[PDB]
């Protein structure tokens, strides 16, 4: 190695941070408190136990827990040994996990008590783990036993930067769950890449040094948005809670003063819901909502409690951050229904990021504000490929660009707003539709609980719209009433308004995912 | 090239900068105004002119003129193109310019009028330059003819991010000049990096979105600290002052209504002292006093007028920007002394920079916060060399770090104080002194102007302390009495307080270099 | 590629075979009828319809039907091209299937009619796949109006004799299906070795040029053991029939004459148990039964019936063949029963085939007759690892052997005799027990089916012993009765004859696995 050639490692981030005050705290949400000093002896205890199990350059980690400081130190200790770093969806199917386990070919693993019942359906049939290691909350973590008897001293190598870091499976269309997987470089450059674009705002969404981060996130899913590392370089105070609750996470705000966190719609929603949540103090907090297409009804309602509420976009292939809606300050002047609006976008593009908007031949289409298309992106932190694929991966960077599979238009100023899914358009005849527009205005309807739009084959204009409804508790109205409440709408293509193809069918049960996202792959299977 | 593969370009900062309004003005002083849509047309048309003169990717271009538009455009359309950019410090002598333009052997040059007699000089004794282009303010800019017959469109190659985009030839002590460059890759770090390291500041001195940006600082020196880069990567409005004049600069940030700026301690005390300052809002201007050793009494006269002056450290082979004042909140309440002391310091290290303090024998002295070493570091963005050079190559990197040449102290904390330079060091006997301390003394009596201290040889004690002052108008006070002013102190080593060698002189005028640096190895070369 | 060079391709075996008559047949059961060649010209139309498919050289074809004249064009024309081709096991479970299609990554599927619905429950999963090709039998085949349309002139590519030929998937114990491979040289050192091994024996068990063959192994298994290539080498009538039922390969034998077959002892039985089997002809036929150990009963009625039978051992990972039960003149005496128990042996090594038996150390053990050890072989025709994997793949060729997973003992002659597996045999204590020699003296009893025998953990011995048996129609006897039914033996080691601990139980149904091999895994799960 050449000392005067840098290599852009996770280390540099931990011991080169931007602050690191010695005295500030992590916090485990009513279990543990230690500081910064503390965190960093018990990363190199960490490292010297990982290099007593026999883990080496090459080994992969697979860590199977909540958030905590245990996987804040796993986010560390590993990637700077050299190994890699699997994060398990711990919401798959035991078949789904017990396949991203065979594929990754684990060595190690480190599971919580709570799922240990998981791998009781699973374990006789993993080959490559040679050690489990039980994750407790109280006095009997093997975790624990094994950190206390390391030295707190450890010369952390220095290696290409290049080295793979983390992979965590994402889970698509494709039938069996899809490798990603990024570098050392990639997520170094990620973190600045990401603070200096958020951190340098005026005055509005802002992470800075004074800020107390609490991820609402799985922290399996795609490194947290990558906001601990971010967090962890500014030197701020974490609170971590473990097992989400909506009242014990509100305790947390409350008592924790958390200033900036990030989540998904639907934790908003029971947060903000809760009775609890009333009596609260939220004129400090800045939650990020990128989880999946903020609602403007949610994000009206959350600005009436003086929260700062913010979309971002990410796909689990991209990072993940790709934009984040940034309102300058002639905007913050709006009253709540067109700031609601604004911050309900998906958001210009970040630093470093390029995403265009491209139709089925890689045509770049004009930025106008109206014409749709699928977005193509480039950026310093994408993964190369699926690992251990090769035509899904062709398929991914075709044409030189990553293919995120959403279609979206995007104005003059910069705004991207998200329209659909590649794969749900509705190919009627010679036009595009998005059938996520007539899901909603079905949702507006009294007497529905939940929509699902399909397109069947027809042998003239192609395949048409076709919507599934399952209706409320003790209200029943046939599908000609409901056929009715949507033509009562207008400026539509095609036929008038597009009103005789509808054919609206009512279901007693929708399937889904093992997740919880609508699967609109085995519907059409179910309905062709 | 593989499209996955993302290479760091100076084009990125450009193209996919962290904000972009084209309707943003770029504001030369009095002379030009544009907007942010016309000054990238003026980079594609500086690209297109550039070709057509034949410049190739390996070829350099040399440029010498003051702080305008045409300098913000020659960082960025050179660099993309492929070609290295030189830049020419005016303020050398004119053998050294010209030793600088053969070592570096540019092909074109862009060379102010008002810098042709300099040129006149030396044009006789130049072979490798085969175009001048000479720069005007009014109409007959060459430059702006040359751009006007080209067309706003180019397309910028894709090359490797460690291709050379920037020299300057910095000059120590060498004798002749030492030439340091980077790569595209350094400066994107380099500018991302800092804007996550002072762009996430609390709240006191941060750089955002809504500032409006004005150089102080020559701009060929050291990139102007990278500040424009940083600049126009945020989107910023900027404000080119050209000539550096106190009242012009006043003029303009009472107009254009500047908000941040960078500048050394002499031109800021020729602002505060101007009438015209007195009567002006100072309130919402936070420069940057990076230049060299921020004094204490200037630091408290500008924060009487409520300014945000904090300093900052750089070297010219180092980025050149490694540490940086920042205050915590809780210092901010301080009053003016103690925040004087604290502001005036070199700073804590930035993201990503090591900076450790060793010895002589590279041993890595306690950051005590008394132990004085020299400063040795490492960062993404420090030169590998100098241009052509092996054995000063070799002393520059010494045991696997970059030696500084300054000596300092570390505290606790983080803050860094340098004491003095390393072949500055009085090596009394066995222990090392610094002759800093004993300069600011002597300037503290009432009939001396100027302290310069060097070392003679003495054959039991090493070298020794040697001052030699020059007296102010009508003041004449023999070497007796200067003596006697600083025994009055106490609280130094060695012999009592090191009195009975002194041996101050009086000097009519004290040798001094090009640039206005007092010249330690001459003053030695005539005195010994 | 050096015309003096040659390369073993699979083209030679079929344009430079040991005899090449072209009036000799090829019979497609009681369905079609041809000569070699059209055979000749039909596996030339295959190589243009697959060229025009945009089949390239890396490309790989799956194969799923019965034993037919298509699946022996598909064993030539694929590899011949280049490509690979991938033999799906047709009796796996169809979530299996759908993983191996998923990890080989199929691009054509060629799929009988008759598995059709098993692919209507995996369709909605596969992504590689862009053409699936319907073969029939008696009109509508797509694969016969691809071939029609296609000239009979075909100049095959020469490349290197190490590019993969084949691929099956053996599914063994570890969790998912393991992918084997071979090349072409492989390939065409299998095939004549085994010739040159087998052909030239003296009298009993030799395959000669007027043989007539008939497969009765399924063909996507192991090659169906090499034999197709072989036969057609040596340029014999082939006879395919299809879907194996017992009555009509009957008739094939007695109408086509058929004398060289191979099966597995479950057929074999099925056969001569048929009434139409009792009045015919028997005396020229010599089936080779090489599935899983050939039983002793079983070899003595089918010698009564003046069969040809013989024993071979194979592994799916090893060709398969690897060694063959062959008699000497002196051997080809004795009455019945001791040539039933010669010829149901594994078998001596063929030519070049290493097979050594060693311990947990690999030490290789003597060849004394009685000393038991796991087989570790060498021969040119072993997969050098599993395809897309590591650990298990370093298992596999541990201590630079491949190790079979077999436990066997060796004679001072060279016959070998497999005793049992090497997962299932009983570590009581400190010494190795087969676990199969105990099951067939309980099969021995007059009120019992089915015996399978696992090893429960026990303080001091170790794993011990424990039967689980299923008792027939109409028969009811205690545990008791059967623990004493084993006890009337003798000659055991350890505790007197091993009594105290078998702990037997009665279990209505017992697990077994997809083909119908008890599943001694599971049984552990439940049964511990
Ligand atoms: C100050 C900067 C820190 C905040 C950065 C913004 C947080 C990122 C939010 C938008 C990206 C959404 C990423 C999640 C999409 C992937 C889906 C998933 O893994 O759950
Ligand atoms: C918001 C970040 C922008 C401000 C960054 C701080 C500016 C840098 C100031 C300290 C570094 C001093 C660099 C000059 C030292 C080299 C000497 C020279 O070339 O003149
Ligand atoms: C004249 C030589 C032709 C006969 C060669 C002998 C045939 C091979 C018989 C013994 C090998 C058994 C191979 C099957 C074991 C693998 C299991 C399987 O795939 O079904």
Same mark, same amino acid.
């Given at each position: 190695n050449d000392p005067s050639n840098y290599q852009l490692l996770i280390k540099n981030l931990l011991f080169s941070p931007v602050a690191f005050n010695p005295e500030q705290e992590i916090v485990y949400a009513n279990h543990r408190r230690h500081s910064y000093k503390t965190f960093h002896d018990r990363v190199r205890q960490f490292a010297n136990a990982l290099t007593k199990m026999g883990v080496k350059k090459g080994d992969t980690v697979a860590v199977m827990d909540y958030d905590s400081h245990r996987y804040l130190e796993c986010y560390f200790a590993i990637p700077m040994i050299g190994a890699k770093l699997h994060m398990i969806?711990?919401?798959?199917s035991p078949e789904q996990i017990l396949y991203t386990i065979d594929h990754a070919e684990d060595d190690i693993i480190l599971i919580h008590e709570e799922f240990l019942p998981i791998l009781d359906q699973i374990?006789?049939?993993?080959?490559?783990?040679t050690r489990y290691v039980v994750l407790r909350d109280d006095e009997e973590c093997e975790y624990e036993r094994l950190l206390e008897q390391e030295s707190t001293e450890y010369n952390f190598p220095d290696f290409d930067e290049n080295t793979v870091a983390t992979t965590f499976y994402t889970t698509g269309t494709t039938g069996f769950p899809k490798g990603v997987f990024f570098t050392h470089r990639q997520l170094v450059l990620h973190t600045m890449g990401i603070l200096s674009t958020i951190g340098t705002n005026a005055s509005q969404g802002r992470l800075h040094q004074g800020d107390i981060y609490m991820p609402?996130?799985?922290?399996?899913?795609?490194?947290?948005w990558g906001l601990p590392y971010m967090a962890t370089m500014l030197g701020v105070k974490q609170v971590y809670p473990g097992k989400y609750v909506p009242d014990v996470l509100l305790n947390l705000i409350e008592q924790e003063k958390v200033t900036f966190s990030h989540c998904v719609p639907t934790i908003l929603h029971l947060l903000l819901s809760?009775?609890? *949540?009333?009596?609260?103090?939220?004129?400090g907090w800045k939650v990020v909502i990128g989880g999946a297409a903020l609602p403007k009804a949610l994000c009206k309602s959350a600005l009436e409690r003086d929260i700062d509420v913010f979309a971002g976009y990410g796909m689990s292939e991209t990072g993940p951050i790709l934009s984040i809606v940034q309102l300058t300050p002639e905007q913050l002047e709006l009253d709540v229904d067109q700031q609601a609006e604004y911050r309900s976008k998906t958001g210009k593009k970040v630093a470093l990021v390029e995403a265009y908007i491209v139709d089925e031949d890689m045509?770049?289409?004009?930025?106008?504000?109206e014409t749709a298309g699928e977005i193509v992106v480039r950026a310093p932190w994408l993964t190369p490929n699926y690992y251990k694929d090769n035509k899904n991966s062709k398929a991914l960077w075709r044409g030189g660009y990553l293919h995120t599979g959403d279609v979206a238009h995007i104005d003059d100023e910069g705004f991207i707003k998200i329209t659909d899914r590649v794969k749900d358009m509705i190919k009627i005849s010679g036009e595009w539709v998005s059938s996520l527009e007539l899901e909603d205005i079905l949702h507006q309807?009294? *007497?529905?609980?939940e929509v699902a739009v399909i397109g069947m084959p027809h042998n003239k204009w192609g395949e048409v719209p076709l919507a599934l409804v399952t209706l409320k508790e003790d209200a029943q109205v046939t599908e000609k009433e409901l056929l009715g409440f949507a033509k009562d709408f207008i400026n539509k293509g095609i036929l008038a308004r597009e009103a005789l193809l509808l054919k609206v069918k009512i279901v007693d049960e929708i399937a889904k995912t093992s997740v919880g996202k609508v699967d609109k792959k085995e519907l059409r299977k179910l309905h062709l």
């Open positions: 969806n711990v919401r798959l374990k006789g049939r993993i080959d490559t783990v609402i996130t799985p922290m399996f899913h795609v490194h947290a809760s009775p609890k *949540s009333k009596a609260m103090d939220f004129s045509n770049k289409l004009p930025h106008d504000g309807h009294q *007497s529905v609980s």
